[PDB]
Amino acid sequence: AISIKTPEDIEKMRVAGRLAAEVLEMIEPYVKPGVSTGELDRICNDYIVNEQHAVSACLGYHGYPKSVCISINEVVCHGIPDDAKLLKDGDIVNIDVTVIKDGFHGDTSKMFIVGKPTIMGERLCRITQESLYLALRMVKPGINLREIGAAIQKFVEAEGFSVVREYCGHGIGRGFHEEPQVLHYDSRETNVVLKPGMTFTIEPMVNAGKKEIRTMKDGWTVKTKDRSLSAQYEHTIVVTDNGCEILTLRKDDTIPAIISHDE
Ligand code: MET
Ligand SMILES: [Co+2]
Ligand SMILES: [Co+2]
Ligand code: NA
């Protein structure tokens, strides 16, 4: 079943969502050539534990050994921070943060460009964020989740990119991954009509080349089969009476916090 959050639950998710967003705001200035992904992870964990008094939902989860996921270039998702993996000028990097506070999860990710913005990968990142924003603008009671995945795929493909099929957004709350699965492509047989108080993520993974992926020697890391660049952005939301509220909004987002579809 998909749980409907109570008003108190939603308030706790506002807090957890803000904390996850804060991690991404904090880490940004550290993302520069020469830093290791292991160091970035250490800085994130320190902040989550010691400044936010929260805990990483990733660390220990199905044995995952780090506190955030950091995915560079052709890595699609679930890249494992490593002390020896150094960022280079021109890299694109996803950092994906999930924190638990007061029993509730907040889950969000964004892309960072290492160095100047006008590089191979910039347009991929921008379009990936735009695909997330397109989807967020659709969320309201009475829409079928089917429609949202179809819209993401149509947009991404019209931009000359492909959508990763094997990974999806998810319900979230007291649990990390709850019902429903939020597909980012058109699947005629879905699904699920949205209702106020549902909380879930949208997190499209978009490849510059072909859609196919390969899962690596470590039980987590996913790369593009063609080693083309891949980008992802993620937000956690709550469905409101006439739209949604974006719980993991950051200072650099360019979409409104609260989206309303009423006249
Ligand atoms: C190591 S679990 C990482 C999960 C990821 N934060 C997600 O959005 O599902
Ligand atoms: Co995430
Ligand atoms: Co997620
Ligand atoms: Na990538």
The owner of tokens 């006249």 is 263
Residue of 117, 116, 19, 130 whose CA lies nearest to 68: 19
Question: Which residues lie closer than 8 Å to 178 by C-beta, 6 or more apart?
Answer: 2, 3, 170, 171, 172, 200
Mutate to test the pocket of ligand 1, among 45, 66, 69, 182 (most ligand atoms within 8 A of CB): 69
Domain of 164, CATH number, reads: 3.90.230.10
For 28, other C-beta atoms within 10 Å of its C-beta total 15
Q: How many CB atoms lie within 10 A of CB 60?
A: 12
Bridge-based pairing state of the strands 230-232 and 205-207: antiparallel
Provide φ and ψ at 126, rounded to 5°.
-60, -45
For this PDB entry, the determination method is X-ray
Ligand 1 atom at shortest distance from the alpha carbon of 97: 6
Task: Show the domain range for 113.
Answer: 1-263
Ligand 1, atom nearest to 66 Cα:
1
Report the first-to-last Cα separation within the chain, whole angstroms: 32
* Angle between helix 7-27 and helix 37-50 axes, rounded to 10 deg: 140
Cα 116–Cα 117–Cα 123 angle in degrees, nearest 5? 155
Residues 213 and 115: their CA atoms lie apart, in Å, by: 27
> What are the structure tokens assigned to 57, written together?
């939902």
CB-proximal residues (5 Å) to ion ligand 4: 71, 75, 230
Structure tokens, 216 = 């690596």
Q: What is the 3-state secondary structure (H, E, C) of the chain?
A: CCCCCCHHHHHHHHHHHHHHHHHHHHHHHHCCCCCEHHHHHHHHHHHHHHCCCCEECCCCHHHCCCCCEEEECCEEECCCCCCCCECCCCCEEEEEEEEEECCEEEEEEEEEECCCCCCCCHHHHHHHHHHHHHHHCCCCCCCEHHHHHHHHHHHHHHCCCEECCCCCEEECCCCCCEEEEECCCCCCCCCCECCCCCEEEECCEEECCCCCEEECCCCCCEEECCCCCEEECEEEEEECCCEEEECCCCCCCCCCCEEECCC
Contact between 17 and 101 under an 8 Å Cβ cutoff? The reply is: no
Beta-carbon contacts of 62 under 8 Å, excluding residues fewer than 6 positions away, are none
- The number of domains in the chain is 1
Say how many C-beta atoms besides its own lie within 10 A of residue 112's C-beta.
20
Pocket of ligand 1 (CB under 6 A): 58, 61, 64, 69, 96, 98, 107, 203, 234
Q: In a 10 Å sphere around its CB, with 0-12 CB exposed, 13-18 middle and 19+ buried, how is residue 49 labelled?
A: middle
The resolution of the experimental structure, rounded to one decimal in Å, is: 1.0
